[PDB]
């Protein structure tokens, strides 16, 4: 259901409440820890992060390498937090390489 | 404001065996392009026109007949390898013209020294009907 | 020379810029969005009319439009 | 003296030659 | 260097799980379809094993057993 | 079993079974009342 | 009669066709054993052909100069069996099909993953729905009168 | 240009763009002067563009006109004409 | 005082160059920022031809419906 989500960030690391049926980035905005975004539709690198523990559903994914899914990277805008996962923010370029 | 690098002839070029995809008469009479990169080591890379060549450890300067071919080779060099490149356009005059990256930073990265060219401050659904620009030389989009 | 226009619905994703084969587009500062960025077309004399940029635009409708126009030898992508 | 014997070659052979030479000359160089 | 029979035991368990799921091999297909184009893609890339994965071993195992299926059809 | 029931209801198999049943029905109907150009009962 | 055609039972070309048809099959029956499988099969189809011609004659079809039973669709009541009663039957069956399909589409439109129930049929729901087609005409009439058959808002 | 590995130099673009002539001779006239003096004296009046074109077109035109307006029957059966009585059509003729 | 329709609303689209024109969608977020010409963000239940299901709109292009 509403598992706690941890996000490392240059601002620090905060915890927010959000139901497994919603994207981590969408409820983050409801609380108010600012994150980057652009398209909001899963087709760009702007909202990129990677994970420390757990894993998010890859069903809400597109315009990604046939590897970015299992090598760590993910999109905050298009992702369902199936567990009490710990993710990274501001992770576009070390993804952009 | 980012004095562009000047082309340095005597810079070697990759080890190639020759191809029928190289330059033609257009390079003789109108223009051709030249790309340069710096090659941490001597390696094999696919030529944007033919087969495979070997980039030398040290300066590499390659002459192509199309700007699009240059950008293709540049993209391949930039993300498959990690190599910074620049290319120029040469005329039959002996003029060279630094082309890319124009202001030192790649265009996918916003730079505070660039002006807006061809930007319309409205949504695409608010162009006038063609009847409104009939018999005047303007195009409804150029407005 | 084809004519490329950028409209204010641009979200400044920059996917189109990363798509163009001939380095026609660019990213420039702006204030109308959350990226403070918008696409410019300062070098349309090199545009081949490929319209890859339009297939990369995630807006609806598009924010980058390519109107094919008078042809040059640069526009026709001719190596001879 | 047979009028076709003259006009069918001239209009079928000469005239297209002259017209096409002239039109190529006109279309294929700069003013 | 020398040549021998070299096998792997039970790499994939026979099951009806993936029959219920249309286009299990393609990540995008597996999730489900938004338009009519998804149905056409499901068939167009059914036997393109070298794009469902990148492992040569898996490609070749699939190829071997598909050949067996074809021989059965011929018989 | 549950998954076999699911797969047997996927669109191609559902439609082939439906159309085979329909074909059987029409075939038998025309096997009993053959060469029918009209409705002669009422 | 209607359109200058004549009752096949009293036509001559219609009979001539029947006799000619029957004639060729009889030839196929010959050159084999009199009571063989193939011969028995040929006999069967001969009797079938005779039954078809007599059935055509009995039903009162109209025959032209070629002896072929023409069909009248103008609405003449002597000929409703040719087009109009089969037409009503077809309209009933097709409305059945379409109404059941529409009923199903409406019923599955409310899930989160409605496409899942379109590439993989919910057969229990479908079997619950199939038999409403039986009353589809009344249901559709009352839906039109209600104003809920056609989507407003579009 | 061509200093071991380099092949690009702004000073000599033609060498860089391969503006060579791979087969030109750069040799003297192989024809003996006497022979040269015979030709360029007799073939001179045909080396003016407009003159040669106009004369060619009109001369060849009247050539064809004369040779076809005055061709004999054994050259073209079209001018020999028919030599047989004609048949009748399916009903007309 | 916030701007535009509230989050989660049901708004009808009025931009005639949009795929979902005269259709309906659900509001996701309307930035309180001025200086943005298209603050409203709307999610739809159907992809467009580019396989995209969310889009930004201006306050006048949306119209809250029932
Ligand atoms: C000769 C002169 C006299 C004639 C008298 C004629 C009467 C009508 C004909 C037959 C009557 C007996 C039918 C068989 C007995 C059990 C039928 C039944 O109760 O079986 C159960 C269903 C229940 O019908 C309705 O079913 C609807 C939907 O339920 C379900 O409908 C489906 C049923 O599988 C699915 O389960 C679906 O998910 C679910 O929505 C309604 O919401 C109600 O629940 C219920 O009233 O009846 C059904 O239609 C079963 C399917 C057959 C229906 C036949 C109707 C007549 C034709
Ligand atoms: C559009 C009308 C027309 C058409 C289709 C033809 C067609 C034909 N004519 Mg003819 N002709 C015409 C008008 C026409 N004529 C007129 C008005 C005259 C003067 C009375 C003649 C006098 C004439 C003669 C003496 C002969 C023919 C002959 C022929 C046949 C051979 C082709 C040829 O030599 O060209 C025609 C030759 C000409 C000298 C025609 C010149 C006169 C016309 C007006 C020239 C028009 C040119 C104009 C600038 C272009 C018009 C644009 C358009 C047609 C494309 C051919 C079937 C030959 C024949 O009998 O074949 C067996 C033949 O010897 N014609
Ligand atoms: C449309 C007008 C036209 C006319 C009037 C002719 C006329 C003729 N054609 Mg012909 N031809 C035409 C169109 C025409 N052609 C087209 C469109 C095609 C393409 C399919 C051909 C393909 C064709 C073939 C393959 C051949 C002919 C041949 C011939 C000649 C056969 C008759 C003969 O034996 O006489 C006399 C025979 C001669 C050789 C007399 C020579 C003709 C004169 C003397 C040449 C002098 C012309 C002058 C110097 C200038 C040249 C043209 C100038 C006005 C621009 C004849 C003079 C046959 C031929 O003879 O080969 C040349 C033959 O092999 N034609
Ligand atoms: C193209 C012109 C034309 C048209 C439109 C018609 C039309 C018709 N002709 Mg006519 N005819 C024509 C030309 C035409 N004719 C010509 C040129 C001739 C001279 C050769 C004739 C000679 C002729 C004769 C001699 C007769 C007709 C008759 C008829 C009627 C028969 C059908 C009927 O009775 O109603 C309909 C029949 C029903 C049983 C009604 C049931 C249909 C249901 C209600 C609709 C089904 C819909 C669905 C299943 C349920 C509803 C769903 C909904 C609520 C959502 C019909 C209205 C016959 C007549 O007079 O009618 C009594 C007849 O005797 N015609
Ligand atoms: C799925 C639709 C369908 C339907 C509605 C029917 C219906 C019927 N079939 Mg049939 N059949 C079908 C499909 C179907 N079949 C298929 C797919 C095949 C395989 C080719 C057959 C092969 C078949 C054979 C071989 C025979 C029938 C026979 C019959 C009739 C039964 C008569 C009887 O034996 O005495 C009455 C039965 C009861 C009173 C109970 C009947 C009306 C039999 C028949 O008509 O006899 C000649 C018969 O012999 N069927
Ligand atoms: C729209 C085109 C069309 C139409 C209107 C028809 C119409 C007809 N065809 Mg034909 N046919 C067609 C296309 C068409 N066909 C094509 C494309 C082919 C090539 C494959 C054929 C090949 C073909 C053959 C081989 C035969 C027919 C036959 C028939 C007749 C059979 C009637 C019947 O089945 O009894 C009545 C059936 C019913 C009443 C079933 C409905 C009852 C339901 C199930 C119950 C409802 C309860 C309430 C009928 C008049 C048969 C015939 O005898 O010709 C006269 C036959 O032999 N057709
Ligand atoms: C064996 C004979 C035969 C065969 C094989 C067909 C086959 C076909 N017919 Mg057809 N038809 C026939 C006889 C036949 N017909 C006869 C005798 C009549 C005279 C009544 C008609 C009148 C008829 C009509 C008016 C139509 C067809 C249509 C069709 C096609 C689609 C049917 C369908 O969509 O299913 C299921 C039905 C649906 C998915 C949608 C429902 C549409 C049907 C007609 C129900 C309509 C109900 C409504 C209340 C009545 C409207 C009245 C009408 C005048 C507008 C199909 C290929 C349809 C077509 O051609 O498509 C362009 C079409 O509209 N037929
Ligand atoms: C729920 C099923 C359904 C219904 C009720 C309708 C109804 C209608 N259709 Mg449509 N259609 C359907 C399915 C359906 N269609 C499918 C699957 C296709 C893809 C081939 C089409 C393609 C189609 C076209 C191209 C057109 C229509 C048109 C129309 C309208 C005129 C009638 C007609 O000509 O139909 C024609 C019928 C067909 C072309 C084929 C029908 C396919 C089968 C018979 C229906 C499928 C039933 C479903 C699979 C059963 C599931 C039930 C559940 C228990 C499993 C009418 C409102 C016409 C229109 O626009 O009207 C102005 C028109 O041009 N339809
Ligand atoms: C054909 C019938 C298939 C039956 C079936 O698949 O269900 C039976 C099971 C699926 O059923 C599953 O079984 C599991 C243990 O095998 C667990 O008990 C699960 O709880 C049970 O759902 O699949 C099979 O065993 C069939 C194997 C392949 C047979 C061909
Ligand atoms: C038999 C063949 C003919 C059948 C004619 C049946 C009646 C047709 C006229 C009535 C149609 C109708 O009531 O709905 C008419 C439908 C709309 O239906 C209307 O919906 C409204 C809002 O829900 C109200 O419920 C009205 O009562 C209802 O009539 O639209 C039309 O068909 C336009 C015609 C004028 C109405
Ligand atoms: S048409 Fe092609 S070259 Fe021109 S801007 Fe678009 S993608 Fe770039």
Q: Which residues contact D7 (CB under 8 A, 6 or more apart)?
A: none
I51 touches chain E (CB under 8 A): yes
Task: State yes or no: chains B and G have 3 or more CB pairs below 8 A.
Answer: no
Note whether C58 contacts A43, CB cutoff 8 Å.
yes
Chain E CB within 8 Å of residue I47 CB:
yes
Kindly write down the DSSP assignment for every residue of A14-59, as one continuous string.
EEE---TTS-HHHHHHHHT-----SSSSS-SSTTEEEEEES---SS
Is there an atom of ligand 7 within 6 Å of G40 CB? no
Going by C-alpha positions, the residue among A57, A56, A55, A35 that lies closest to residue A46 is A35
Residue of E nearest to A63 (CA): E28
Q: Tell me, what DSSP letter sits at residue I6?
A: P
Is the Cβ pair A69, E27 closer than 8 Å? Answer: yes
Q: Which domain holds residue G69?
A: 1-154
Find out whether the peptide bond into C61 is cis, omega within 30 degrees of 0.
yes
What is the Cα–Cα distance from H48 to H41, expressed in whole angstroms?
14
Annotated binding-site residue? C13: yes
Q: Which CATH architecture has domain F1-42?
A: Up-down Bundle (1.20)
How much distance in Å is there from the Cα of G122 to the middle of ligand 1?
17
Non-local CB neighbours of H63 within 8 Å, separated by 6+ positions:
none
Ligand 5 touching residue F8 (CB < 6 A): no
What SS3 class is residue C28? strand
Distance A27 CA to ligand 6 centre (A): 62
- Nearest CA among I13, I19, I28 for reference residue I64: I13
Contact I9, I23 (CB under 8 A): no
CA of G95 to the centre of ligand 7 (A): 9
Report the residue of chain C nearest B119, measured CA to CA. Answer: C6
Q: Report the residue of chain B nearest C43, measured CA to CA.
A: B117
Pairing mode, strands A5-9 and A86-88: parallel
CA distance G54 to H14: 97
Residue G12 in 3-state DSSP?
coil
- Residue ranges per structural domain of chain F: 1-42
Does the Cβ of F16 fall within 6 Å of ligand 5? no
Q: Is E19 in the pocket of ligand 9 (CB under 6 A)?
A: no
Is G90 buried (19+), middle (13-18) or exposed (0-12) by CB count in 10 A?
exposed
Burial profile B24-63: b = 16 or more Cβ within 10 angstroms, e = fewer: bebbbeebbbbbbbebeeeeebebbbeeebebbeeebbbb
Contacts of H90 (CB under 8 A, 6+ apart): none
Would you say the C-alpha torsion I35, I40, I41, I47 has a positive or negative sign? negative
Give the CA count within 13 Å in the CB-facing half-sphere of B30: 12
* HEC readout, chain F: CHHHHHHCCEHHHHHHHHHHHHHHHHHHHHHHCCCCCCCCCC
**Could you say which DSSP state residue G120 is in?**
B
- E20's tokens: 């219920």
Distances (CA, A) of B97 to C60, F9, H10: 38, 66, 12
How many CB pairs below 8 A link F and G? 42
In the three-class reduction of DSSP (H, G, I as helix; E, B as strand; rest coil), residue G99 is classed as helix
- The two three-digit tokens of residue F33, written as one number: 């009342």
Closest CA relative to residue A24, chosen from A93, A94, A74:
A74
d(CA B68, CA B47): 13
CA atoms within 13 A on the CB side of G143: 14
Q: Which helix (H) or strand (E) holds C14?
A: none
Residues 6+ apart with CB under 8 A from G112: none
Please state the domain count of chain G.
1
Atom 25 of ligand 9, nearest CA residue: E15
Which residue out of G108, G128, G132, G138 has the highest number of ligand 1 atoms within 8 Å of its CB and is therefore the one to mutate? Answer: G128
Structure tokens at G19: 């006799």
User: Rounded to a whole number, what is the distance in Å from the CA of A75 to chain C's nearest CA?
Assistant: 14
Q: Which of residues 56-95 of A touch E (CB under 8 A)?
A: 58-59, 61-62, 66, 69
Q: Do C15 and A37 touch (CB under 8 A)?
A: no
Write the CA distances from E61 to E14, E44, E66, integer angstroms.
Answer: 15, 21, 9
Q: Which residue has the tokens 């943005």?
A: I36
Three-state SS across chain B?
A: CCCCCCCCCCCCCCECCCCCCCCCHHHHHCCEEEEEECCCCCEEEECCCCCEEEECCCCEEEEECCHHHHHHHHHHHHHCCCCCCEEEEECCCCCEEEEECCCCCCCCCCCCCCCCCCEECCCHHHCCCHHHHCCCCCCCCCC
Residue C36 CB contacts under 8 Å (≥ 6 apart), including other chains = B110, C12, C29, C30
Measured between CB atoms, which of F6, F39, F40 is closest to G120?
A: F6
Q: Name residues whose C-beta falls within 8 Å of residue H73's C-beta, 6 or more positions apart in sequence.
A: H79, H80, H81
The resolution, in angstroms to one decimal, equals 2.7
| Total tally of structural domains belonging to chain B | 1
Please give the helix or strand (H or E) that residue H18 lies within, else none: none
Instruction: Give the residues surrounding ligand 11 with Cβ less than 6 Å away.
Output: C 4, 19-22, 24-25, 47-53, 66
Solved how?
cryo-EM
Separation CA E29–CA H36 (nearest Å) = 82
Distance (Å, rounded) from C-alpha F9 to C-alpha E16? 13
Query: Which residues form the domain of B102?
Result: 1-143
**Rounded (to 5) percent helix, strand, coil in chain C:** 10, 20, 70
Crossing angle, helix G13-29 and helix G37-59, to 10 degrees? 170
Cα distance between residue E70 and residue E58, in whole Å: 18
Distance F19 CA to ligand 8 centre (A): 17
Ligand 9, atom 15: nearest CA belongs to which residue? Answer: E15
Domain ranges (residues) in chain I: 1-66
Whether residue B38 contacts residue B56, with contact meaning beta carbons closer than 8 Å, is answered with: no
Structure token pair of residue H42:
């007799």
Q: Supply the Cα-derived Rg of chain E in whole angstroms.
A: 15
Q: Contact at 8 Å (CB) between C59 and C10?
A: yes
State chain E's maximal CA–CA distance in angstroms.
Answer: 53
C-alpha span between H33 and B135 (Å, rounded): 67
Give CA–CA dist G144/G150, Å, rounded.
7
The token duo for A28 is 């983050």
Phi, psi of C17 (to 5 degrees): -55, -45
For B123, the token pair is 């949504």
Taking only residues 46 to 75 of chain A, the set having a beta carbon closer than 8 angstroms to any beta carbon of chain C reads: 46
- With contact defined as 3+ CB pairs under 8 Å, the chains touching C are A, B, I
How many angstroms separate the Cα of B100 from the Cα of each of B86, C25, C42, G65?
5, 12, 13, 86
Asked if B89 contacts B71 with a C-beta cutoff of 8 angstroms, the reply is: no
Q: Is B39 left (phi over 0), alpha (psi -120 to 50) or beta?
A: left
Q: Is G47 left (phi over 0), alpha (psi -120 to 50) or beta?
A: alpha
Pairing mode, strands G6-7 and G62-63: antiparallel
What six digits make up the tokens of E51? 């794009």
At least 3 CB pairs under 8 A between chains E and G:
yes
Instruction: Please tell me whether C33 is known to bind a ligand.
Output: no
């Amino acid at each position: 259901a509403s598992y706690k989500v941890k996000l490392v960030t240059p601002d620090g690391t905060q915890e927010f409440e959000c139901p497994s049926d919603v994207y981590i980035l969408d409820h983050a905005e409801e609380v108010g820890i600012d994150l980057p975004y652009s398209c909001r539709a899963g087709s760009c690198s702007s909202c990129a992060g990677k994970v420390v523990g757990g894993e998010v559903d890859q069903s809400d994914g597109s315009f990604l390498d046939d590897e970015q899914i299992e090598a760590g990277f993910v999109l905050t805008c298009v992702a369902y937090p199936t567990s009490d996962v710990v993710i990274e923010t501001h992770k576009e370029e070390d993804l952009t390489a | 404001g980012f004095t562009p690098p000047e082309l340095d002839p005597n810079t070697p070029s990759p080890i190639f065996g020759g191809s029928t995809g190289g330059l033609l008469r257009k390079a003789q009479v109108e223009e051709f392009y030249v790309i340069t990169w710096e090659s941490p080591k001597e390696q094999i890379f696919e030529m944007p026109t033919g087969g495979a060549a070997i980039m030398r450890e040290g300066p590499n300067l390659l002459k192509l007949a199309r700007k699009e071919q240059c950008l293709a080779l540049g993209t391949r060099l930039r993300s498959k390898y990690k190599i910074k490149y620049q290319f120029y356009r040469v005329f039959p005059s002996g003029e060279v013209q630094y082309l890319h990256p124009k202001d030192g930073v790649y265009p996918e990265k916003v730079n505070p020294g660039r002006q807006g060219v061809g930007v319309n401050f409205r949504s695409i659904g608010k162009n006038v009907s063609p009847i409104e620009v009939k018999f005047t030389g303007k195009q409804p989009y150029d407005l | 020379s084809h004519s490329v226009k950028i409209y204010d619905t641009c979200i400044g994703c920059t996917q189109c810029v990363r798509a163009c084969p001939t380095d026609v587009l660019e990213m420039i500062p702006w204030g109308g969005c959350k990226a403070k960025q918008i696409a410019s077309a300062p070098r349309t004399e090199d545009c081949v009319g490929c319209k890859r940029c339009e297939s990369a635009c995630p807006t609806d409708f598009l924010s980058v439009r390519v109107y094919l126009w008078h042809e040059t030898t640069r526009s026709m992508g001719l190596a001879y | 003296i047979n009028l076709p014997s003259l006009f069918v070659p001239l209009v079928g052979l000469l005239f297209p030659a002259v017209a096409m030479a002239s039109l190529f000359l006109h279309v294929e160089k700069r003013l | 260097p020398e040549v021998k029979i070299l096998v792997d035991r039970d790499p994939i368990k026979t099951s009806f799980e993936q029959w219920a799921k249309p286009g299990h091999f393609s990540r995008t297909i597996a999730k489900g379809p938004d338009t009519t184009t998804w149905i056409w893609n499901l068939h167009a890339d059914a036997h393109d094993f070298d794009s469902h994965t990148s492992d040569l071993e898996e490609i070749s195992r699939k190829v071997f057993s598909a050949h067996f299926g074809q021989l059965s059809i011929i018989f | 079993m549950r998954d076999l029931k699911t797969y047997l209801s996927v669109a191609p198999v559902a439609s082939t079974l439906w159309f085979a049943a329909l074909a059987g029905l029409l075939i038998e109907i025309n096997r009993f009342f053959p060469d029918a150009l009209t409705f002669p009962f009422f | 009669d209607i359109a200058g055609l004549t009752p096949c039972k009293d036509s001559k070309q219609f009979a001539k066709r029947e006799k000619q048809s029957i004639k060729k099959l009889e030839s196929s029956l010959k050159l084999y054993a009199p009571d063989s499988a193939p011969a028995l099969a040929i006999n069967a189809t001969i009797e079938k052909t005779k039954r078809r011609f007599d059935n055509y004659g009995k039903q009162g079809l109209l025959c032209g100069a070629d002896g072929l039973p023409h069909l009248i669709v103008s609405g003449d009541q002597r000929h409703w069996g040719e087009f109009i009663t089969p037409g009503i039957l077809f309209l009933y069956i097709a409305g059945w099909i379409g109404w059941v399909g529409r009923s199903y589409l409406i019923a599955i439109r409310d899930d989160k993953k409605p496409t899942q129930k379109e590439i993989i049929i919910d057969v229990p729901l479908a079997t619950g729905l199939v038999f409403r087609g039986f009353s589809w005409p009344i249901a559709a009439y009352r839906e039109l009168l209600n104003g809920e058959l056609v989507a407003k808002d579009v | 240009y061509g200093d071991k590995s380099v092949y690009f130099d702004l000073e000599d673009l033609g060498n860089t763009t391969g503006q060579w002539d791979l087969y030109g001779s750069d040799a003297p006239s192989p024809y003996n002067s006497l022979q040269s003096k015979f030709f360029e004296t007799f073939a001179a009046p045909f080396t003016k563009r407009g003159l040669l074109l106009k004369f060619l077109i009109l001369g060849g035109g009247s050539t064809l006109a004369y040779f076809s307006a005055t061709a004999s029957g054994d050259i073209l059966p079209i001018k020999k004409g028919p030599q047989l009585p004609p048949q009748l059509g399916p009903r007309l003729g | 005082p916030p701007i535009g329709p509230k989050r989660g609303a049901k708004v009808k689209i009025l931009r005639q160059e949009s795929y979902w024109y005269k259709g309906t969608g659900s509001v996701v977020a309307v930035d309180q920022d001025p200086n943005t010409r298209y603050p409203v963000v709307v999610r739809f239940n159907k992809v467009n031809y580019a396989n995209v299901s969310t889009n930004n709109y201006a306050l006048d292009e949306v119209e809250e419906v029932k």
